[PDB]
Amino acid sequence: PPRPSSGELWGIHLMPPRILVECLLPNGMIVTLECLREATLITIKHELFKEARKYPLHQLLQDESSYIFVSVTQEAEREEFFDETRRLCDLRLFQPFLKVIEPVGNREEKILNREIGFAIGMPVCEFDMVKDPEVQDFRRNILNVCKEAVDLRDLNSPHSRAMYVYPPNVESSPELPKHIYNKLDKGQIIVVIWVIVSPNNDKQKYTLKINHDCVPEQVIAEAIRKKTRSMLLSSEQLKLCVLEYQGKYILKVCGCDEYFLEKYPLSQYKYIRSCIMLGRMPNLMLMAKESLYSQLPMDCFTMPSYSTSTKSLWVINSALRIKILCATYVNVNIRDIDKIYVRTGIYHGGEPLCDNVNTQRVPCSNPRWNEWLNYDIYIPDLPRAARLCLSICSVKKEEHCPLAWGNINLFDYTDTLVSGKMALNLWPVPHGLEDLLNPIGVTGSNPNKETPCLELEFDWFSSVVKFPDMSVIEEHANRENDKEQLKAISTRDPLSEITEQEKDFLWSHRHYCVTIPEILPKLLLSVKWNSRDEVAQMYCLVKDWPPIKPEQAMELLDCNYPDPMVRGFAVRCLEKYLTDDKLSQYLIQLVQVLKYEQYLDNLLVRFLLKKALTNQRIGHFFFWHLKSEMHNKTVSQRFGLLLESYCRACGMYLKHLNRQVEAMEKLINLTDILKQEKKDETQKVQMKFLVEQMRRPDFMDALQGFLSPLNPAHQLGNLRLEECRIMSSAKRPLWLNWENPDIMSELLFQNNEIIFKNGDDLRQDMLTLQIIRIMENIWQNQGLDLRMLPYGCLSIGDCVGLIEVVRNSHTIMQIQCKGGNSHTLHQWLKDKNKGEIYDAAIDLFTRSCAGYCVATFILGIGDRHNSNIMVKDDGQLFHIDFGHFLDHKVPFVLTQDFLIVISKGAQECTKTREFERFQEMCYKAYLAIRQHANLFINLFSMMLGSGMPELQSFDDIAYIRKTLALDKTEQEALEYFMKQMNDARHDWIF
């Protein structure tokens, strides 16, 4: 099992400077050697064999080059330390000892296996010992997706490898909004290409002015032409040279690892489109093709070690029946709680297929029922995604409360109906759930066998009952001026109530609906899933359904749509239509919806793992998102088996990921010590402790020269130690600083700053920030020029995360503290940006302020404290720390402060020329989100699975409807919002 802390030994956070390690020599002897914690295994082995000749049986000991160290780790496994560069402190030992042996078996296999294990945080050999067919099949079978992806990466290998590793960071649509054309100078952008031309950084500029819609090759071509101008050749001799040498070069963003490897327009690359908006100068570096292509690890994925009568369901003429026999364990007062009973029910996702049926009451002391339970459903009428939910329940009659819960799939991954005896280790009830059953939670037995175990039995029939193949089902299955009614439901939100009248209305016109694809979600929640007959018709519909937007397909992957034909349609809509761009931005939701899938092997994971191993930028976040949720016991096995399959095939990025994982562990451990044993000590004492530990060679090596988890394009080079510090908070977050080793850091990122926080759940912030991005994206691509700042935030594990530092930004509180008044906020922004920038920086303030008032309101994150709003020097306003608000629990944050800045004039301003615009911005902004309500509802709907206290049911999400005023006419909703805007007019420390 994973190790529970990041300590250097079991029990101990930090080894002291010198450790006595007990060495087990291969001749038999025990020698007790004093080692430095930082010491390498090379130096330990050398000092061991020196001192080993002072002991008996020394004549037996061969050259130390012939031997390797073996010890037990905190994960309770035998690690063979082949890499003897590793330090003592970094080994993660159980107890301070080492065993000298001669190595055995296949070398590269064993090393790779440890490497896969370290990144995941679980040993590989633990999967090898799992006694489960679905698990062992998943492992053998999933390698097919991996075989595809490796075969896809290596087609036209030089270019296609580079594309994997440095995918173009590009928008979804080439067409750019009209408000962005007007940033350009008569259809054209001024660019600077740079070149290195000698061992020393002898730098040369090339300022070009080129069509925004040029490809990188054409941008290169213009560079070549400019160099060639001094030379005297024909026009058709320029051409010859330019043409051949267009495709020996690659453009790269100065300051980070972002390459222009693909034939997209220059404007479609996010970095350029950002420069156009901000009105900045692009600096790209020119760089030789072979000089990148050589750096590419010539990689190759070789395969690992690991590689009866039936009748259809509809031939069986009976009602479903289950026997509840008895339970092993009940944890109960036996005084206050008298009796206990097993509540049961058959569910299709969250909706139940038939009445619930209970057992008789028994005394807690002897929990044995031994009773056939009768379900009000025919066996054929069972759908594919049907499953049993049950729980043991207590009584005071007067008071019912659930003790342990569990759900079981009624069909195997091989579509076999369950039969015979079966034990089920139950689960503890979640925190604030008082429902008798928990149909939401994972399906299967508890890995922790030290829990209440419920025995039960299912009927045996002549043969092995299987669910029929699709072709058999396809066989069986085979009004005017109410189209105003159909379209009018197909626009209404996914959480809106659809009456039994409107259900019967939709089902009746099902065949028509094929015209209006977007209605499928509404249509499906009208089907009676407890009808073999209705079901089979739908299946024929879904099979011949037109495609739909991904944004809308994503609805069909949440809890409410557990049917595999419904999900398979959805996944197919993504396979075809979802762009890498778009994928990346909804990756949080897509991973989380893997939970709701019934089986390990399925179309969605196969889709995701393909895309993850096809594109490294998706792969990186794919890894983290998954790894972060590994501590969670319900999902660890699946996500583990998945992260295993990825790490196997991902290539050389595993080594990059290990260095990240290692760097985070040190930081976890470092924080843990300050949080626990050094908790009381003053700021001076701690800071003294921190710099001492941060200077050590084990720390410096592990946390220098690795890629940021927030962004793998950003390299983190040498620590600027003098600028690293512990923050003020009682959780002790770490402000870190890095030199940027990129050759031309000066232009873009001289300093990478990251906050490392231990102990606070950052998933809420992570989900909030994602949504602010999409609100900006919707506004921007519709012509509404509102500028948000969804800074970087990543969860790396259980209340451990990183935060991007927005530079040159101060909280409103900061500004207040220095002076004070309304005019001082203005004066600061004027003070900083004067002349022909003052006009542009107020125009930035307005737009940012508007967006974080509309988004703030719709999300219900209004009435925010001043300390939580920041301003960049250039004038961009943004909100921070969305966790700090949703934990603690006026609609808008608009203040007379900011109104002075936007109007930029007389203090006594009710309305102004400038103000009126600002207001019209908000209305257009607000109305833009209202018209995209459905997407945000669905984004939140897919994150119900995820354990978050704020998103546990659809009832929580319904606040969004109230803010958007979806029920009311559009015109009305403007009025509703305008109320809130007006309404939000008007000792600060306490």
Next chain:
Amino acid sequence: DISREEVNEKLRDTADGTFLVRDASYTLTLRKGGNNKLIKIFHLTFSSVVELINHYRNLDVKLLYPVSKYQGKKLHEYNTQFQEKSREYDRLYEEYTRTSQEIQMKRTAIEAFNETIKIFEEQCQTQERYSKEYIEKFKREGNEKEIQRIMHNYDKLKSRISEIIDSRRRLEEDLKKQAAEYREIDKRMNSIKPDLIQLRKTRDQYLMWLTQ
């Protein structure tokens, strides 16, 4: 004009076919399948809603059970006895979550001790294998001063195993101490949570603007 979060509250552990009326932006909800149906009323073969509702009561499904409307300072005493239980519980769940992790830790540290001892026992087999030929050579040569160094070392090796074995065996006992402590925390949780269910339905109260 009740909310969608208040229909579900009133259908919870109700028999199927319970019914009630609501205002729309009227809506006749119902309990059947273990669900919440909607059958809206447009405000029509019958000359009333009042006349209409009364027939069905006697897959069109019967209105078995009705919801009724009916069921200051002696509720301000009970909210005080909801603030005690809710603190006491969260404190138990705090202690439950810790103990849960700490048990899981002890269970790893045993597996580890097992694998550690397994290594050290192999060392005894290693040493007895190799020492065998050298012990005999020293017997022949009658060199006790050197057989003492071989035995001394073995005395530390076999001695070190015992120290680890009690370390393991001491933790195995502490596990059973912690496990029991864990069963009693969960016994005291499950015997408070029901109380906090039917002292919540109590929270529903008359609506006045003033607080406390």
